[PDB]
Design a protein around this ligand. Structure first.
Ligand SMILES: [Mg+2]
Ligand SMILES: [Mg+2]
Ligand SMILES: [Mg+2]
Ligand SMILES: [Mg+2]
Ligand SMILES: [Mg+2]
Ligand SMILES: [Mg+2]
Ligand SMILES: [Mg+2]
Ligand SMILES: [Mg+2]
Ligand SMILES: [Mg+2]
Ligand SMILES: [Mg+2]
Ligand SMILES: [Mg+2]
Ligand SMILES: [Mg+2]
Ligand SMILES: [Mg+2]
Ligand SMILES: [Mg+2]
Ligand SMILES: [Mg+2]
Ligand SMILES: [Mg+2]
Ligand SMILES: [Mg+2]
Ligand SMILES: [Mg+2]
Ligand SMILES: [Mg+2]
Ligand SMILES: [Mg+2]
Ligand SMILES: [Mg+2]
Ligand SMILES: [Mg+2]
Ligand SMILES: [Mg+2]
Ligand SMILES: [Mg+2]
Ligand SMILES: [Mg+2]
Ligand SMILES: [Mg+2]
Ligand SMILES: [Mg+2]
Ligand SMILES: [Mg+2]
Ligand SMILES: [Mg+2]
Ligand SMILES: [Mg+2]
Ligand SMILES: [Mg+2]
Ligand SMILES: [Mg+2]
Ligand SMILES: [Mg+2]
Ligand SMILES: [Mg+2]
Ligand SMILES: [Mg+2]
Ligand SMILES: [Mg+2]
Ligand SMILES: [Mg+2]
Ligand SMILES: [Mg+2]
Ligand SMILES: [Mg+2]
Ligand SMILES: [Mg+2]
Ligand SMILES: [Mg+2]
Ligand SMILES: [Mg+2]
Ligand SMILES: [Mg+2]
Ligand SMILES: [Mg+2]
Ligand SMILES: [Mg+2]
Ligand SMILES: [Mg+2]
Ligand SMILES: [Mg+2]
Ligand SMILES: [Mg+2]
Ligand SMILES: [Mg+2]
Ligand SMILES: [Mg+2]
Ligand SMILES: [Mg+2]
Ligand SMILES: [Mg+2]
Ligand SMILES: [Mg+2]
Ligand SMILES: [Mg+2]
Ligand SMILES: [Zn+2]
Lengths: 244, 86
RNA sequence: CGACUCUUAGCGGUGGAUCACUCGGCUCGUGCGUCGAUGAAGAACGCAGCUAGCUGCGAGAAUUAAUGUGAAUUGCAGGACACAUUGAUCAUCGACACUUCGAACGCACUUGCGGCCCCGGGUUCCUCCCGGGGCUACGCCUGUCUGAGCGUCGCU
RNA sequence: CGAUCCUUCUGACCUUUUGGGUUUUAAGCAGGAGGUGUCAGAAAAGUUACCACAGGGAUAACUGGCUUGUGGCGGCCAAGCGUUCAUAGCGACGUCGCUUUUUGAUCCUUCGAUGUCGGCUCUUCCUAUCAUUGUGAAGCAGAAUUCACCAAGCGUUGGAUUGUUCACCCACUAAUAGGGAACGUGAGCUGGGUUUAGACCGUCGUGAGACAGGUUAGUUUUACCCUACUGAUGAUGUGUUGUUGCCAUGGUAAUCCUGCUCAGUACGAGAGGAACCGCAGGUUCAGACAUUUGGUGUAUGUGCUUGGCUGAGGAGCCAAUGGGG
RNA sequence: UUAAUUAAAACAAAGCAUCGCGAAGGCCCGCGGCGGGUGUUGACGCGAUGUGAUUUCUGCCCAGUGCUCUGAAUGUCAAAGUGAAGAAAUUCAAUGAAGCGCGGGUAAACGGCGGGAGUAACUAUGACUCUCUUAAGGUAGCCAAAUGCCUCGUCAUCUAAUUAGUGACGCGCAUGAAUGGAUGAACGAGAUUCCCACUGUCCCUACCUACUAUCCAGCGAAACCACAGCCAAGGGAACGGGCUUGGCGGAAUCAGCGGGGAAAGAAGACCCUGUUGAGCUUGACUCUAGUCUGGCACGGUGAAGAGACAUGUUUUUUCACUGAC
RNA sequence: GGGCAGGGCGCCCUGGAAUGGGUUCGCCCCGAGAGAGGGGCCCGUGCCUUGGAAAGCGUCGCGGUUCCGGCGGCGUCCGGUGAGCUCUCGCUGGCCCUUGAAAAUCCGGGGGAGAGGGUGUAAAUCUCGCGCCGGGCCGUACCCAUAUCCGCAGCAGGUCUCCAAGGUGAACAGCCUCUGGCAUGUUGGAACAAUGUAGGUAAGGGAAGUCGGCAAGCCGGAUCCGUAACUUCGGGAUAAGGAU
RNA sequence: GCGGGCCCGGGUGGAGCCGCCGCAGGUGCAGAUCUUGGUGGUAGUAGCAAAUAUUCAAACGAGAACUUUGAAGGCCGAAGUGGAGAAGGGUUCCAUGUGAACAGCAGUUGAACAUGGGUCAGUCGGUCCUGAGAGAUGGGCGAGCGCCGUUCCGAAGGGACGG
RNA sequence: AUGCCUGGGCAGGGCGAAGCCAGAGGAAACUCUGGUGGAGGUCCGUAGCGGUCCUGACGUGCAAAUCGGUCGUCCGACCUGGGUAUAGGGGCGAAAGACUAAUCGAACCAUCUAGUAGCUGGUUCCCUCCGAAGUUUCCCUCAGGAUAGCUGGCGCUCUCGC
RNA sequence: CUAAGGCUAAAUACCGGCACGAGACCGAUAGUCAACAAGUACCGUAAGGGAAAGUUGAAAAGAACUUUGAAGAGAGAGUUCA
RNA sequence: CGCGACCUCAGAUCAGACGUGGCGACCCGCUGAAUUUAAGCAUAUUAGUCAGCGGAGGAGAAGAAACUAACCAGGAUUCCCUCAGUAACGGCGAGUGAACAGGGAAGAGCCCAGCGCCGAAUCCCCGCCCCGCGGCGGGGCGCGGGACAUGUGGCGUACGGAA
């Protein structure tokens, strides 16, 4: 009768993200007249490490062409981006690494990162540590562009939405083994309270459907329908196939 | 360990004196009384504890203003008059 | 006959049963049937010559004024009063007064920080500073003033 | 072979269908059916070793009670085994008994609780006698062997394995006989195994879970009361005290073995091979005692030593008895 | 890691392998909202599981229960809509979504992976052969294991002696491959066997020290209490301190002691009953949040086309617009 | 406050180096300017000086029956050392699939919107040196733990910190001592019976006891030798075993 | 008087009480591990045994093993039985006096009791700032007390210089 | 119990990973020797944290879980103060049904509530008279009821040693 | 009858509040928890829980004074009908 | 390119008022169970009850038929007796369960919108004068303001009304 683990994550207050020392949301620059028609140049100041995120971030300072002030954005640093480098963004921006421009302008076969799912959402796709999206084809009619996500799926997006040329810096983290429970603890201490995971078969049958029994076994098929109530949808959710 | 040893570390208090009811029931962290509900405009009371209602009711306190109202009604709520001078 | 132990009786101990008392309860019935932003209920803190509690009172703090009555209050002193005098105490109570929280009302609850006017100390309005006095919450109705609209129109 | 309620069918020129009239529908009246097999008729799957409550000795798991099927033990007849010969020693086919040291049947006492299996320690009792004392019998020549009688006085051991009762082996021995005492003995001990809660394996079940199937870790409380017992003051009488004694009554205790001589004798074809009286001693048990040997040792007795402390020498102290002869 | 009986082989752990999700999304919270957590997030991420370092390997089976895929070639299929006859209430008919049926995939999903005979010039075993069967009939490995009833299996070693330990065999009641098999250095207050040294665990006990216990001055409770307290036998509610017959009995006490008082504690924790409950499970009976699907309203504008009825109506299929959202 | 030692500089000027050089415990640096010279800046809690010897302390002697916070002579000195302990400052590195707070508040800089008096004066002084006035309200005792807190109590339990001498010794280990603290932990006296609780010692045997080496005992520090099977090559390892 | 009980005598007591005919009831105790209060045996018994330790003389005092002073012997042995704080306590701090009650013996002693006294800030902290978080307005929900949310469906700054 | 914010703390030794220096061998690849270095979810071990064994002491105790010896760990998945968040069919849980104020296989407080019990226990003065049954039938009935039977009380209708 | 608009006293109820009256009621373990400094003391972090406790005497006339003891305590004396 | 009316919408320490909370025995509007009974239990019963929320007064609510009846008719609402443990509801089981008429207590009726007729004939606020002003009213004087034609007031409402 007890509420199982996984349901208690929805309420929060113990599974909330650890955002105390995070440097800020890594959002792409907002669309304006310069971005839409020409291009605007910014200067890379420093590359910062964001806790809980493998990919490093880069602070780029622009100048607002409406008021006398210096705007600062926190982009996701691509491979090869160094401090004291001019980075351009706009329709007329050239095809260089760390240079955000609309996908319609970029030719086919281009590798991009921080791709916008919708025009103006300031970057949503292929931005984790080293992932990248590849543009496949352009459709001048209806203003559509096909992109291949790192998951292997192909999605059709508008040609207006922008993306950053190159791959996300910091790739290859998963190659190094953790080798210790302590390193996993330190890794997950900066993200959430989710690392120590207890198997359902090791629990009592009051707090998990897989618990109980004189032998540590499941006793029921692990596959479960997607239309299953909370507290029962555990194991392999809507598994088309299960084995190796 | 759960008994005598555990009673040793009762060092910090959770309730303080409420300024509306006067009882030591004001919760510090929640900023709520639970005896009268001071942050709430209405006083806290329930019908499942009649003895609690009897402990703090109209007749318990000073009745500094109501006792005068009783006699003023008993004579007729007269105002702005004086008895006949000698 | 000894000491201890057992029963009964007289007296003396522990204990407060019984009886008689009762300014207290329970039940029924009659009349009236009244709170508060002019600040309710409740809470806190203080007030007596000697005053802890109860009760009463609110910096005018064991009570002020007025009315009625008429020689006390009292545990002790002190005494005011001439009790042939509005005159001690009492009761009534219509005048006045009524600290801090609390619907609680400048902002929060630490008794901490402020703003708008007037007066005094300092000045000779000179702003600092000090003290005192009056304001500064939310919602809402009528009306006044100042406003906005590529809302609907009229003149130029 | 089947009540109420409900449904369905059949019957009347049947009643109502509500202010009245007509027509559908519906509700009634009477007779059949649809069914309750727990059959005088609820609509109904498990587990709990995480468990709870009210009770029950009306009811189980101990002991104790009746019985003795079964277990154990003992007789009666005598077909036969025994070289001949039923009864030296056995004894079929039949039959008569005893014991509750085995498992069984019963539920009589105990469920407002009588602490269980073993092992250790200790006392006493029984004989259905293993050995020792005294004897009867042989298919007893000696030795040895078994059968039987009076007989429980005194003995019935040390270990490997297993929690074990039981069981088997090694060694010694005269013998390593069998049992009871709430299946003696947990305010006597232990907790190894049963038998709570945590876990592992195998089987079973969809599952939670189950297993006289295995494995592992798992708190053993209280006596100062009465009696009993062990000791210690005492008590009624003897006029009071002291000395020396008697005795009724209770308890009781000693036990077994080896070597020499007999004697390589009796006996015996031989192989082998005794016994009595004597001598020297040993095992177990009981009562004492420290001359000797050993142990203890804080006479804190006397040296020797580590660290520190009284300035040092000397003399000492502290280090829960500093340590060591 | 179970505070207060279980520190462990249990949990966790890096490694390994699957499942879902490209955002009006996956998982989840919330009675409620243009609500909220993951998310200051974007597949090298988040969420859900299984196994559990390194090495090696990961056998066969989709019959069953799950999960998943598409599919007007479709049996069943509610509401709403359409037609029918009737005076109407109506009933009938056609149409007809999801889901169940029907067809594939998936076991590092839950899981499972047999039996009977004949047969090699001594016996034995058995290569090999035949038949019946399921969805395959246990493959590589391993074992009398923490897993084997028989069992203290058989042989060797370890001992004088071993139900213990180890090493081999497989006949495996009932081993077995991510419900992971085998192996494995270091490590472990984890479970066992043997050996060296060591020692009072023992043969077999003794002595010494400190604090109690002892006595005294002072101070001083609690548990418990039908009445009380010497035995044998009898009968009795089948084990008496009281009853009967006998043995007998003598004030008041002190220090021990644990045989008895079926001693004290807790209205037995075991078992059974109750038309008494609770935690948990599901193929038990009734339901329910959530979730999938269909209809009605918010729900408009334009352009083309077809079926059906009929000789204008509905169904409407597709495309385009935004002003609702 | 002023001055000066002493540290640090990823600050500057001359100059251009292989025969490579400088340099640390380690590192590290150099034609993107190393060694060698000359400067500059920061911290200076250290030394001298005003404060400040007047005061404080150790001594020796007095005034005053008493009260009396007094009066006076002297001294408060010279040096060296240390992987020594603690605090602090400063360089240099190593680790992160861990990257290790916000705000109040203060300051510097880029610009010149504007001001000033006009030839002795003014506007300005992120005020240079002095001089004047004010700083409101609340807490301040004591315990802070084998007796002032929580456990029913003066309960062997629990409860967050700072200061940290000598000897021995690797050591903040154990033992003794100094400054400081106390009376032995809700009582004392007299004996030393049995059972106990806590320490030990035991001839010969050495686990024969027990379910089981339970408990106890054996070894133990340092120096010099030596150290096997196995192994993931890292370990095992203080293996084991010897001498001082 | 079979009995339930009752009538007299004596003592204590000091203010109300009873018989008969009827009426009415919160009307009769030995038990309920009954409720409340009190009192026994146990019993002058268990016990006043965790952390090495006390002795001598004097003073006050009716009274001294426990108070004070001096001497001796000890322990805590700078992670102390030392010196100061935080939370908590709330007068327990200081002086004087009493020994009724408490400090499980005693006490001339005390944290007991009774009288008084004592806490002095621009510089030490609260006060200021924000952190994790909490929580109004606008907005939405809710039958409703209210709830959701902290920038989200806001005409959100009442401030300032120069004229 | 867990997450977050802000602070504090953790003697003395052993083993000896990278990196670096010097010497020797080589034709090179490079390899040996001696040093420096101080890495490790490293080891012995104190403080701290925890609690294996003696199944020791105690077990109407110092204590409603403490004490002695012996123990595991002791630079990291470490220990700890204060602030803050999660509230009862809920929380939290390196998972023991563990913890959630001495209570946890569903906390505490008040009310519904004097909940129900076919089940235990108790149920208060005297005398007189009469005086039983554990049996039939039915019941989800077997520790219980209804129904017949057994019992008491109140009468009535009559007969008569009239 | 004329809904989807509205007003209206009386006969009715009153375990709270103000002020009175009464009883076949209880008489300090009873009657309200509370006859008295009772929602008080006290307990728990809190929601909350929650007591025990009346009587000299008509009048204090409440025992002057002597004596032992440090005192608590006694022996005399005195008051009162006691 | 600005001004002037209107409609919608803001700011006020603008002038004058109003609501907030408490008690809650009785009352009104919501929400709303389980113990329990059925000898089990799920519909039922407990029960529109307790618990929870909101809102007043001295009473509250209700109230003058879109009624009852089917008679030779009655005639607002509220309460008492009876109807009546009845009609009816209900595993038609346990159980639940009104209304009409009749006799009484009391008794009281009315007002708008619309329809239409009257020169908005109507109402609120500010100034002055007179009266009384301690439950701030009446009259008069103000080319003083505002509301109102997106409709105030007079006549008039089902029993008919207006001329
Ligand atoms: Mg488990
Ligand atoms: Mg479940
Ligand atoms: Mg289990
Ligand atoms: Mg029986
Ligand atoms: Mg037999
Ligand atoms: Mg012979
Ligand atoms: Mg026995
Ligand atoms: Mg016994
Ligand atoms: Mg025992
Ligand atoms: Mg065991
Ligand atoms: Mg178990
Ligand atoms: Mg299975
Ligand atoms: Mg010497
Ligand atoms: Mg435990
Ligand atoms: Mg343990
Ligand atoms: Mg799996
Ligand atoms: Mg399948
Ligand atoms: Mg052995
Ligand atoms: Mg198998
Ligand atoms: Mg398996
Ligand atoms: Mg008896
Ligand atoms: Mg006994
Ligand atoms: Mg019972
Ligand atoms: Mg039954
Ligand atoms: Mg149930
Ligand atoms: Mg240089
Ligand atoms: Mg202080
Ligand atoms: Mg003490
Ligand atoms: Mg001692
Ligand atoms: Mg002492
Ligand atoms: Mg020995
Ligand atoms: Mg040992
Ligand atoms: Mg080894
Ligand atoms: Mg004694
Ligand atoms: Mg010591
Ligand atoms: Mg101290
Ligand atoms: Mg003091
Ligand atoms: Mg005392
Ligand atoms: Mg023990
Ligand atoms: Mg004891
Ligand atoms: Mg379990
Ligand atoms: Mg009752
Ligand atoms: Mg029954
Ligand atoms: Mg009779
Ligand atoms: Mg009779
Ligand atoms: Mg009372
Ligand atoms: Mg029922
Ligand atoms: Mg019942
Ligand atoms: Mg029931
Ligand atoms: Mg109902
Ligand atoms: Mg009305
Ligand atoms: Mg009527
Ligand atoms: Mg009737
Ligand atoms: Mg009109
Ligand atoms: Zn309050």
């Amino acid at each position: 009768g007890r509420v199982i683990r996984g349901q208690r994550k929805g309420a929060g207050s113990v599974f909330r993200a650890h955002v105390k020392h995070r440097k800020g949301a890594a959002r792409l620059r907002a669309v304006d007249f310069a971005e839409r028609h020409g291009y605007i140049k910014g200067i890379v100041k420093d590359i910062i490490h964001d806790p809980g995120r493998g990919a490093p971030l880069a602070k780029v300072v622009f100048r607002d062409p409406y008021r006398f002030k210096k705007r600062t954005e926190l982009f996701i640093a691509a491979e090869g981006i160094h401090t004291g480098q001019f980075v351009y963004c706009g329709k007329k921006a050239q095809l260089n690494i760390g240079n955000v421009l609309p996908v319609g302008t970029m030719p086919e076969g281009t590798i991009v990162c921080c791709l916008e799912e919708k025009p103006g959402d300031r970057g949503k796709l292929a931005r984790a540590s080293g992932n990248y999206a590849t543009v496949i084809s352009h459709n001048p009619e209806t203003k559509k562009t096909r992109v291949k996500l790192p998951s292997g799926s192909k999605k059709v997006i508008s040609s207006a939405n922008r993306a950053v040329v190159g791959v996300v810096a910091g790739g290859g983290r998963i190659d190094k083994p953790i080798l210790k429970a302590g390193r996993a603890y330190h890794k997950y201490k900066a993200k959430r309270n989710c690392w120590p995971r207890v198997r359902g078969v090791a629990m009592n049958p009051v707090e998990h459907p897989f618990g109980g029994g004189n032998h540590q076994h499941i006793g029921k098929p692990s596959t479960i329908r997607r239309d299953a109530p909370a507290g029962r949808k555990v194991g392999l959710i809507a598994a088309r196939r299960t084995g190796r | 360990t759960k008994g005598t040893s555990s009673f040793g570390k009762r060092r910090n208090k959770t309730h303080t004196l409420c300024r509306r009811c006067g009882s030591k029931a004001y919760h510090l962290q929640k900023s709520t009384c639970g005896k009268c509900g001071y942050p709430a405009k209405r006083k806290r009371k329930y019908n499942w504890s009649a003895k609690a209602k009897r402990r703090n009711t109209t007749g318990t306190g000073r009745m500094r203003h109501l006792k005068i109202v009783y006699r003023r009604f008993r004579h007729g709520f007269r105002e702005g008059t004086t008895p006949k001078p000698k």
